[PDB]
Design a binder for this molecule. Structure first.
Ligand SMILES: [Mg+2]
Ligand SMILES: [Mg+2]
Ligand SMILES: [Mg+2]
Ligand SMILES: [Mg+2]
Ligand SMILES: [Mg+2]
Ligand SMILES: [Mg+2]
Ligand SMILES: [Mg+2]
Ligand SMILES: [Mg+2]
Ligand SMILES: [Mg+2]
Ligand SMILES: [Mg+2]
Ligand SMILES: [Mg+2]
Ligand SMILES: [Mg+2]
Ligand SMILES: [Mg+2]
Ligand SMILES: [Mg+2]
Ligand SMILES: [Mg+2]
Ligand SMILES: [Mg+2]
Ligand SMILES: [Mg+2]
Ligand SMILES: [Mg+2]
Ligand SMILES: [Mg+2]
Ligand SMILES: [Mg+2]
Ligand SMILES: [Mg+2]
Ligand SMILES: [Mg+2]
Ligand SMILES: [Mg+2]
Ligand SMILES: [Mg+2]
Ligand SMILES: [Mg+2]
Ligand SMILES: [Mg+2]
Ligand SMILES: [Mg+2]
Ligand SMILES: [Mg+2]
Ligand SMILES: [Mg+2]
Ligand SMILES: [Mg+2]
Ligand SMILES: [Mg+2]
Ligand SMILES: [Mg+2]
Ligand SMILES: [Mg+2]
Ligand SMILES: [Mg+2]
Ligand SMILES: [Mg+2]
Ligand SMILES: [Mg+2]
Ligand SMILES: [Mg+2]
Ligand SMILES: [Mg+2]
Ligand SMILES: [Mg+2]
Ligand SMILES: [Mg+2]
Ligand SMILES: [Mg+2]
Lengths: 51, 148, 159, 222, 58, 49, 127, 185
RNA sequence: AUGCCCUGACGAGUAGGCAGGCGUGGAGGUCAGUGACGAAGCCUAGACCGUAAGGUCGGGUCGAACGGCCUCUAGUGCAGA
RNA sequence: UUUUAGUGGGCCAUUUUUGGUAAGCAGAACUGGCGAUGCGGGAUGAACCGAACGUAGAGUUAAGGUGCCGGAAUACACGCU
RNA sequence: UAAUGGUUAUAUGCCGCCCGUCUUGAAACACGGACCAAGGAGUCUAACGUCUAUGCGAGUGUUUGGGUGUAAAACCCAUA
């Protein structure tokens, strides 16, 4: 009789999408990224700062 | 019934269904069949081709009771025998007592062969017959008798 | 007054295609037309008999009747708010085969052939044509190809 | 002895495996969206390290919002907008990018804002504004059972299946996109920017391609 | 009076309000317009096909 | 005027026909008076048939 | 009293008066649709009177109900009153305008005996 | 505003009830509305629609048309169903024993069916003894054999029977009908 | 059961078409209808119902007849000429 | 598929046009409008811009604006006069 | 309870040109209208066309006439 909006109303957020519980549990939307230490080539930054 | 017409629905509206620009007049096309060869020709040809002109011979003093020749077909021909006696003629289909059908007394002038009488012999007293109608009656074992 | 004849406004259309005047070359008379073949109507001006009206130049239609030197071609003509079937008696030197239908019929033979080794193995061979899909990933190298262009040029009149 | 309780035991059982299926497939999609964006991020880092230039895959999906009303439209863009189901102002539709659609977009360019929708805007549009065409009859989605009743034959069983077939242009994108009744969006909440809409986005209006800035605009319209 | 002679303005709006139809083709067209020699033989080439079909089934 | 696909009519009503309209309202009246006349005559021409 | 009902919303309580009925005595206030080709009423120019249209129609739950929650039934005599014995929470009797003063006594006595709301129990009372 | 692609508030163009105020025909519609709703056999949906049809849309079915459909292969024991009137035919001399379910039977067509041991059945008796249309055979009479269809599409080179009152010589057999008098059609 | 209910979409408009209704004079039926204890008419910045056509009621005036409903019928609805 | 009404005086705008020095001119083509259409804006206007209309409530906008009339910054910024 | 609400009069803010008509275009310095009551304009008929309803249906149509009657009704009927 009345459309309730998921992204409000956590009950209808869980009626659809049972993974919404797990996403909020493992926080999954603010998850870290690994810190890799790649550096660009010399020709990339030289071309970037080129006139 | 005057209440069911659209005159009762046009009360209040100005033009009574006839339009303002057109403005319903006396006779905009001429009275009756005016200009059938001039300004009604696209209606005279297209839905009435052949109206203008003459066709063949004139017949002075035609009496239609000369031309009285009502046609009965062999698809019926047996309805003239009454329905009670009809079944005892179809069964016991024989010569030597065959039903007599006065075609003229039923009011037909010519007998025509539309098709497929049974194989019962009948005696037919017709004024005229056709060729096929003669053959089909005789192929059933009957006869055509000419009367006047 | 106004002129609305048969070959009106056909000054350039029935013309004879520079340095290709003269006789009709014999491949036109050796082409074979069957009923159902799809043909392009292009009038040859050097043949005045069996010549289509100017409406049908460039139109494409289907052969329905075959006579001694002429095909009968069916063209759809928009007349008011509908199309009407036009049946044209044109000699075969105003007529060539539509090269699209040769391109179609080979694809029918191709799709029959490609579905054969779809029946040996690996069903749903994906034989429908697809449009130009967006490009994939690339990795553009720079070895020998360092990126260089300068700026916009100034204004010079260079007369 | 009408025997309800065994059937209610069976139905509440069958709902539980069905949500178990949905839960693991959403976890499957969540991992694959994450690795896909991580691969593209690392590919750019790798190419910059290897002196090269990673060129992205060209975008396979646009989201088209009609930003112009109904009157005074020429016959050709009027027909293209009807074939894209943009029949009123602020309507939205996802469009798979091919050459046959890249030329439809160039016809209707001064009437639409389009651009490349992200996962978030696809998720929010389908969550908030998602409706289904079921006996044409515009059913709000609101439950996963009415997606599986109409798109289960293509293996789409939840709302997050339906988003996945839209963001990843799957083999049943056409059936999933035409199932969605066109999105009836509001006017944007901070306005449009742009004192005049009906110039191109490049010159300072709204229409045309605003490639990834469609996400700012559609989330304002949501 | 002086009158506007001719214009085709508004003529394609009326042409599309009722939706232009292609002429609705059929299997088996009419044999009007065919070479009469071919049609004459085609009467017999289809009569004998029916005789060889109707006798072979019965 | 001549109008849509309709049969050509031959209504003969361009004389002064409304002076010569005879409506037989008296069909029931003439029947009683004919039946009165036969009863009157049969009494007059008693036993004759 | 009556049944429970929602709050009665009328959407337009104002009478729909005919255009220029205020201006000429020959034009009655009875509603007539302006069918003039120039008419600023018909063309819905801003500033002009409202026209009756089906959007103003009453909600069907509360349509035909008096503010007392009853549909008015017009009653001539005691027998016509007694078709309302079971429907005393939906129908109110209105004694007709041409009923005698002594006959209005007898109707009001039975409607009190039956529990029917009579919406005009004061016509032709010597007071 | 909406760029509409279709005419708004369009009716279906189909009868949903008979125009007739026949009380018994409304009862049959009531009977077959229930059946078409609750049975899922397609016979009851076709029959209920044909109850709505007008008198020219229900042409008579002759008994010789009934007999010719029983000459069909393996259809001798089916139930002939005519949503309309069954009329006689004296052009046929043998009629088979069969079950006919019609609205009306003429007094001759009732005679020719019950003389051959058949039975003339109303459609409510049909729904009792065949509620899914089991072993039935719907027959429809010829619509375009009507005298009014001949005048439809009368035009040039159409051959379609001019709307005329008078027949013979002097009546539309002249200019426009022969290449002698003017032109030919 | 041209009922009751569920669901979805839609709603501009001259000329024009059609549908569903309102009102008037007279007719068949009905309400064993109203009525000299007051019919009909008329007046009423009093009341009520209907989106509306209109319907209803109260008060005043008045003095002999007149309504509802199912139908029939038309000399049937006015701001203009 | 049948049947039928009105219409058969037109006008404007963009673009491409013929004639004309030019026209709120006389004539064409394609489209969109007006006629037949209200609403917000252009002070005002048939045609422009925005947008087409059941009755209401709330939100957000369009085109256009935000000194005062007049709802909305005598806002911020760089200059020019 | 006139407290809310209705009606009504007034006041205030903002809006609102005179209707009908012909016209491409009307508030026009285009035509008609000083006001009011009453009357006042797509009807009936002959012959038909499409459609629809009804009766009967290879037939159909009693009503020109005749019989009958409680008398312009109703009912019944031969040959055309
Ligand atoms: Mg009108
Ligand atoms: Mg007029
Ligand atoms: Mg002349
Ligand atoms: Mg020329
Ligand atoms: Mg705000
Ligand atoms: Mg003209
Ligand atoms: Mg009110
Ligand atoms: Mg009112
Ligand atoms: Mg009035
Ligand atoms: Mg106007
Ligand atoms: Mg409307
Ligand atoms: Mg109504
Ligand atoms: Mg009356
Ligand atoms: Mg009394
Ligand atoms: Mg009184
Ligand atoms: Mg007063
Ligand atoms: Mg007196
Ligand atoms: Mg009158
Ligand atoms: Mg009036
Ligand atoms: Mg007057
Ligand atoms: Mg008037
Ligand atoms: Mg003309
Ligand atoms: Mg004119
Ligand atoms: Mg010039
Ligand atoms: Mg207007
Ligand atoms: Mg503006
Ligand atoms: Mg304006
Ligand atoms: Mg100005
Ligand atoms: Mg200003
Ligand atoms: Mg509200
Ligand atoms: Mg201010
Ligand atoms: Mg008090
Ligand atoms: Mg009080
Ligand atoms: Mg108050
Ligand atoms: Mg003002
Ligand atoms: Mg006009
Ligand atoms: Mg005016
Ligand atoms: Mg005046
Ligand atoms: Mg004057
Ligand atoms: Mg005067
Ligand atoms: Mg009057």
């Amino acid at each position: 009789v009345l459309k309730k909006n998921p992204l409000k109303n956590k009950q209808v957020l869980l009626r659809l999408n049972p993974y919404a519980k797990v996403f909020a549990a493992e926080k999954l939307g603010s998850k870290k990224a690994e810190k890799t230490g790649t550096k660009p080539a010399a020709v990339f930054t030289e071309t970037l700062k080129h006139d | 019934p005057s209440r069911f017409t659209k005159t009762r629905k046009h009360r209040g509206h100005v033009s009574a269904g006839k339009g303002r620009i057109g403005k319903h007049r006396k006779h905009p096309g001429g009275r009756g069949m005016a200009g059938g060869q001039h300004h009604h020709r696209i209606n005279m040809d297209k839905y009435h081709p052949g109206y203008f002109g003459k066709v063949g011979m004139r017949y002075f003093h035609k009496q239609q009771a000369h031309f009285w020749k009502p046609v009965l077909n062999l698809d019926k021909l047996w309805t003239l025998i009454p329905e009670d006696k009809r079944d005892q003629y179809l069964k016991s289909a024989s010569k030597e007592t065959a039903p007599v059908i006065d075609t003229l007394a039923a009011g037909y002038g010519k007998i025509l062969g539309k098709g497929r009488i049974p194989n019962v012999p009948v005696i037919v007293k017709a004024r005229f017959v056709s060729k096929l109608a003669e053959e089909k009656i005789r192929a059933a074992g009957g006869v055509v008798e000419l009367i006047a | 007054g106004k002129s609305h004849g048969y070959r009106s406004r056909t000054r350039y259309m029935f013309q004879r295609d520079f340095r290709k005047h003269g006789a009709v070359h014999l491949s036109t008379y050796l082409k074979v037309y069957k009923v159902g073949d799809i043909v392009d109507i292009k009038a040859n001006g050097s043949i005045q008999k069996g010549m289509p009206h100017k409406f049908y130049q460039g139109k494409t239609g289907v052969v329905y009747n075959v006579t001694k030197s002429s095909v009968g071609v069916i063209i759809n003509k928009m007349v008011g708010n509908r199309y009407l079937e036009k049946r044209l008696n044109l000699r075969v030197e105003h007529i060539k085969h539509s090269k699209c239908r040769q391109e179609f019929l080979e694809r029918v033979k191709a799709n029959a052939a490609k579905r054969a080794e779809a029946k040996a193995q690996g069903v749903a061979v994906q034989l429908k044509r697809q449009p130009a899909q967006p490009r994939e990933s690339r990795i553009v190298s720079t070895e020998g190809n360092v990126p260089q262009t300068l700026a916009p040029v100034p204004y010079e009149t260079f007369i | 002895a009408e025997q309800v309780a065994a059937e209610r035991a069976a139905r509440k059982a069958a709902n539980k495996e069905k949500r178990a299926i949905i839960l693991e497939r959403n976890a499957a999609y969540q991992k694959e969206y994450e690795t896909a964006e991580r691969n593209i991020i690392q590919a750019k880092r790798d190419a910059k390290a290897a002196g090269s230039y990673y060129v992205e895959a060209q975008h396979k999906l646009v989201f088209v919002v009609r930003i112009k009303g109904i009157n005074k439209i020429p016959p050709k863009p009027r027909k293209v907008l009807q074939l894209l189901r943009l029949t009123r102002i602020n309507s939205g539709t996802f469009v798979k990018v091919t050459k046959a659609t890249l030329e439809l977009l160039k016809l209707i360019e001064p009437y639409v804002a389009y651009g490349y929708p992200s996962y978030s805007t696809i998720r929010q549009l389908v969550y908030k504004r998602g409706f289904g065409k079921i006996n044409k009859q515009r059913v709000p989605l609101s439950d996963n059972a009415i997606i599986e009743a109409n798109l289960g034959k293509y293996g789409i069983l939840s709302i997050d299946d339906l988003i996945h077939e839209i963001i990843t242009v799957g083999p049943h994108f056409k059936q999933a996109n035409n199932f969605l009744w066109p999105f009836k969006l509001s006017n944007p909440s901070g306005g449009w920017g742009v004192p005049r809409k009906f110039k191109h986005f490049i010159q300072g209006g709204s229409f045309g391609n605003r490639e990834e800035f469609i996400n700012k605009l559609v989330k304002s319209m949501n | 009076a002086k009158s506007k002679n001719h214009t085709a303005h508004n003529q394609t709006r009326k042409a599309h309000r009722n939706g232009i139809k292609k002429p609705k083709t059929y299997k088996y067209p009419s044999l009007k317009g065919v070479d009469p020699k071919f049609r004459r033989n085609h009467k017999h080439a289809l009569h004998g096909t029916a005789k060889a079909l109707a006798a072979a089934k019965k | 005027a001549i109008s849509k696909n309709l049969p050509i009519l031959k209504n003969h009503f361009r004389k002064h026909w409304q002076e010569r309209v005879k409506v037989h309202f008296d069909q029931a009246g003439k029947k009683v008076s004919r039946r009165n006349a036969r009863a009157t005559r049969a009494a007059k021409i008693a036993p004759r048939p | 009293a009556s049944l429970p009902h929602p709050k009665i919303v009328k959407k337009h309580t104002k009478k729909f008066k005919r255009h220029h009925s205020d201006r000429y005595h020959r034009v009655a206030e009875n509603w007539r649709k302006q069918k003039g080709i120039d008419s600023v009423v018909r063309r819905r120019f801003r500033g002009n009177i409202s026209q009756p249209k089906i959007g103003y129609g009453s909600n069907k739950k509360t349509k035909f109900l008096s503010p007392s929650g009853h549909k008015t039934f017009l009653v001539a005599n005691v027998k016509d009153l007694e078709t309302l014995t079971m429907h005393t929470k939906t129908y109110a009797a209105e004694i007709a305008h041409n009923i005698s003063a002594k006959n209005r006594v007898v109707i009001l006595a039975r409607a009190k005996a039956l529990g029917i709301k009579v919406t005009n129990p004061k016509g032709r009372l010597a007071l | 505003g909406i760029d509409h692609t279709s005419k708004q508030h369009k009716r279906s163009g189909h009868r949903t009830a008979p125009k007739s105020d026949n009380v018994y025909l409304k009862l049959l519609v009531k009977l077959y509305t229930f059946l078409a709703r609750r049975t899922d056999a397609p016979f009851n949906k076709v029959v209920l629609k044909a109850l709505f049809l007008s008198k020219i849309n229900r042409p008579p079915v002759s008994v010789s048309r009934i007999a010719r459909a029983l000459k069909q292969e393996g259809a001798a024991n089916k139930t002939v169903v005519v949503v309309g009137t069954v009329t006689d035919d004296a052009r046929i001399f043998e009629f088979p024993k069969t079950t006919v379910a019609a609205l009306r039977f003429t007094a001759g067509a009732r005679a020719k069916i019950v003389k051959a041991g058949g039975e003339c059945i109303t459609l409510d008796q049909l729904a009792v003894r065949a509620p899914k249309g089991q072993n039935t055979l719907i027959l429809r009479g010829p619509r375009n054999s009507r005298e009014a269809v001949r005048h439809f599409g009368m035009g040039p080179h159409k051959g379609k029977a001019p709307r005329i009152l008078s027949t013979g010589r002097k009546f539309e057999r002249a200019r426009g009908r022969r290449r002698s008098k003017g032109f030919k059609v």
